């Protein structure tokens, strides 16, 4: 089960002994029909960093899940503004260059993201453990069962990885084709 972060932080820090499980028993290594322990390069053999690896994986998955939808939506709809109009910016891939620099539109996003990351670094480093890796307490809609929680974590990880690859595919295809959503 998942315990409140206050209780979970009681046993937190860089563990030195190793639970003898694949990746310390973390969720996300499960095939469709059986068990799929994917680690060809043996990165999980650094058991002390395994919690950091899971935190980074979940951060990347969530960020790419947002990024893919943010590459899809703008072409269909835009913010009601003159500088966000299709005439000022034809495709999402143009947004970075359009809003970089003195305009500050992307500078504000960078600033707020940096503030959020500065505030979350304490959990990322100090209070990171096998059970609280990627857990910020936003557990609304989280099932109240062990199997349900495990399945939800697996679904998050799988969708995050799918979007992690899909964002690379979509951004590369969009840069290559200069085309609307279908090629991204």
């Amino acid at each position: 089960l998942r315990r409140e972060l206050a209780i979970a932080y009681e046993d937190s820090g860089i563990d030195l002994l190793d639970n003898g499980k694949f990746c310390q028993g973390l969720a996300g290594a499960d095939g469709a029909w059986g068990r799929y322990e994917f680690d060809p390069l043996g990165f999980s053999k650094k058991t002390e960093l395994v919690p950091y690896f899971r935190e980074a994986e979940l951060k990347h998955g969530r960020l790419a899940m947002l990024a893919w939808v943010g590459m899809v939506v703008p072409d269909f709809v835009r913010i009601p503004g003159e500088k966000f109009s299709f005439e000022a910016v034809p495709l999402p891939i143009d947004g970075h260059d359009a809003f970089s620099g003195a305009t500050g539109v992307n500078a504000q996003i960078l600033f707020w993201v940096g503030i959020l990351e500065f505030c979350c670094a304490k959990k990322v480093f100090e209070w990171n453990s096998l059970e609280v890796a990627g857990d910020y307490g936003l557990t609304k809609f989280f099932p109240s069962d062990e199997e349900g929680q495990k399945k939800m974590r697996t679904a998050e990880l799988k969708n995050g990885r799918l979007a992690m690859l899909a964002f690379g595919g979509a951004i590369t295809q969009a840069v290559i084709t200069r085309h609307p959503f279908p090629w991204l």
Partner: protein, 134 residues
Amino acid sequence: ISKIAYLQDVPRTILEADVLEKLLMNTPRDQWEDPPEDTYLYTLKTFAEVYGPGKATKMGWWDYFRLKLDLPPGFELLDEDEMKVAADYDKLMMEGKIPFAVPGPAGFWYTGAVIQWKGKEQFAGDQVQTLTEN
């Protein structure tokens, strides 16, 4: 070795097995019992006496970071071949033989030759052998 308590079952996180073997090989055998204060083996002993099985199984992120910073990596310690080469060099010099070298531009080249530096009178500085005179 088995007789050393702190070297038994050192957790992989504190120090890898291969790096531990290399460190022990590099360090003189007599120092394993109680290494000097300023040595990687001393750091390993001090931290293995406090961390590991049957002891503190967790560490703060910063404490672990500092421990990994101040413990040695594998590539920092000398290799078997390097230690053999250094030992042979020192043995030659102490035996009174000189692996011949000639100074070059801001350095010296090794000609691959071993000469007899000490002459017939070992304590005589006049008799040290050189190709130029001897």
